[model samples]
Target: NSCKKVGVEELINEKGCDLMIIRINRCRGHCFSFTFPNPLTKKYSVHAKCCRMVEWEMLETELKCSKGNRNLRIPSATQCECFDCLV
Candidate 1:
């Protein structure tokens, strides 16, 4: 009972799940997933490298947040092009 979603800044800080899977939803299916940094830091270079290892987009999308700061868009598998803007 969940929907597809793109990675979030919080997930990047967590550095637990892989960014590729979070973005592409590889084998994790459409479950609500995230990436977390073992040691959270403002430096995103290292994490960005990890994401590139799996061909994940190099850019963050401009997501629309609803009331209470809820995200509005649910990334679908077909939205591969969504990453193109990142490049």
Candidate 2:
């Protein structure tokens, strides 16, 4: 299991304007999963984990759409960790 940075393109709609991001960082990785035969077969473990961001920073961004240009804040990942998958 690990967590790391992955660069992906940001999508913007409306045919003309787009959101500008400053130093956007995204996270991606695999988590741990295991299974084994247990004498206590009455029940089994059906749990899983996933890699996700634990720390992030709000970055200043710009939106140049119908309006001239508006400043906004977007989240960027700074740290990652393996945790129970609930999402």
Candidate 3:
């Protein structure tokens, strides 16, 4: 599967209080990555990359805790591509 956005479970722990149980958008899945074993020897002509978000935005939401109200900023993936894997 290519890089795409999916509904994933997330939690925010604030002072042992459950403020919000929200399903935030996330980027996941696999990208094209392969290794070539030629007749001569095993070599690499391409770099193995990873599925990552190329463009995204923060989702501004509010949460109500037991004590007071809290504002949160979460990441929302809008676009994705195969990127270089960080070591």
Candidate 4:
């Protein structure tokens, strides 16, 4: 049972292109999970988040790559969460 529904087939048929399901939420006091292909890794699970808006542990992860292994750069001053990544 799920609160959110996505129609990938309809999107592909109508637009002839790939799609990403960005926003979804659960009303049963449970978490919402989604999967999308990653452009950088060409792999799934590159962007997955749980929609537990008030839960801090559900929002943060300690998997940041080291400086030498990352090509990080300063982001725009504006602050925002990437979909459910904010929890």
Residue-by-residue lDDT tens digits, candidate 4, 1-87: 122322222111214333322222222223445788886888876445442223221211122333322222221212222246544
Q: What's the TM-score of every candidate structure?
A: 0.15, 0.60, 0.61, 0.19
Ranking by lDDT: 3, 2, 4, 1
What Cα-based lDDT does every candidate model obtain?
A: 0.30, 0.73, 0.73, 0.32
Candidate 4: where is the Cα deviation over 4 Å? 1-28, 37-40, 45-49, 53-83
Candidate 3 CA-lDDT value = 0.73
lDDT of 2 by residue, 1-87 (tens): 887877656654545577443447888998887656566885655677888888888877677877576677778888878877776
Better of 1 and 3 by lDDT: 3
* Worst ten in a row by lDDT for model 4: 5-14
RMSD of 3: 4.6
Compared with the true structure, what per-residue lDDT tens digits does model 1 show for residues 1-87? 122234443332223322321243321222222346555575342221111122333433443233222222433332222121134
Instruction: Give RMSD to native, each candidate.
Output: 16.1, 4.1, 4.6, 20.8
How many Å off is the CA of 44 in candidate 4?
2.9
Q: How does model 2 fare in lDDT? A: 0.73
Which is the winner by TM-score between candidate 1 and candidate 3?
A: 3
